[PDB]
Structure 1
Amino acid sequence: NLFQFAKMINGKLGAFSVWNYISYGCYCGWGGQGTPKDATDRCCFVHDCCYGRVRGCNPKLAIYSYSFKKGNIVCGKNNGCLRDICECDRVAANCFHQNKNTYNKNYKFLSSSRCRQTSEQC
């Protein structure tokens, strides 16, 4: 669920990091249309596509097994759809970390008017 995704993000990037993704670009957080603006925004777009392929359960409510092992996120012994959801979150948190130094504060809290491009396809 998002509680766990937040723990992955803060565990990988540092305390309070999750709040930087509440609304960023066209896809991180409260967006969902247009073209990803940069690498961080693409991490979010891919994460949305990943959740969209999950069948069998609800990514927002599903509680999966995972843990950090020596700084690395490891999805645990999950069955079916839980495996998939955990993997979506793991990949996205690592993606946010990989691209942390390209985070553009000017992309926070964008209005939908900045995302009026033909929405990209998964």
Structure 2
Amino acid sequence: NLFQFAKMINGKLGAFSVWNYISYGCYCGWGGQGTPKDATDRCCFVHDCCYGRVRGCNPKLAIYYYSFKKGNIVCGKNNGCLRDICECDRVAANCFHQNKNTYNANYKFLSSSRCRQTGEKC
């Protein structure tokens, strides 16, 4: 669920990190339309595509199991839709951490007028 996604982000990037992903680019947290603005936004777009492939469970509400092992996110003990959801989150949190250097604070809190309809597909 989102509670757990937030913990992955914070555990990977540092306390308060998750608040950076509430509304960023066209796809991080909020939004959901347009061409991803940069690599962090692309991580979020891929995460929505990942969530879009999940069937039978609700990605915001499903509680999976994960842990940190020597600072790395490890999904474990998950069956079916819980497995897939955890993996979506794990990969996205890792992708944010990989692309942290190019996070652009001017892409925070974009309005829909900055994210025009495009042909962006999963």
TM over 0.5: yes
- In 2, Cα distance between equivalents of 1:3 and 1:101: 25
Q: Deviations over 1:52-96 (max 9, x none)?
A: 000021101000010000000000111101000000000000000
- In 2, Cα distance between equivalents of 1:78 and 1:116: 37
The DSSP-based 3-state class of the residue aligned with 1:9 is helix
Q: Deviations over 1:20-49 (max 9, x none)?
A: 000000000111000000000000000000
Structure 2 unaligned regions, length at least 5: none
Compared CA separation, residues 93 and 46, structure 1 to 2 (3 A): same
Q: Deviations over 1:94-120 (max 9, x none)?
A: 000000000000000011101004141
- In 2, Cα distance between equivalents of 1:105 and 1:80: 37
Q: TM-score, normalised by structure 1?
A: 0.98
CA contact (8 A) 1:40 1:99 kept: yes
The DSSP-based 3-state class of the residue aligned with 1:68 is strand
Q: Percent of pairs identical after alignment?
A: 97
Compared CA separation, residues 119 and 108, structure 1 to 2 (3 A): farther
CA contact (8 A) 1:33 1:119 kept: no
Equivalent in the alignment of 1:2: 2
Q: CA RMSD in A?
A: 0.7
- In 1, Cα distance between equivalents of 2:85 and 2:101: 26
Q: TM-score, normalised by structure 2?
A: 0.98
- In 2, Cα distance between equivalents of 1:46 and 1:20: 18
The DSSP-based 3-state class of the residue aligned with 1:28 is coil
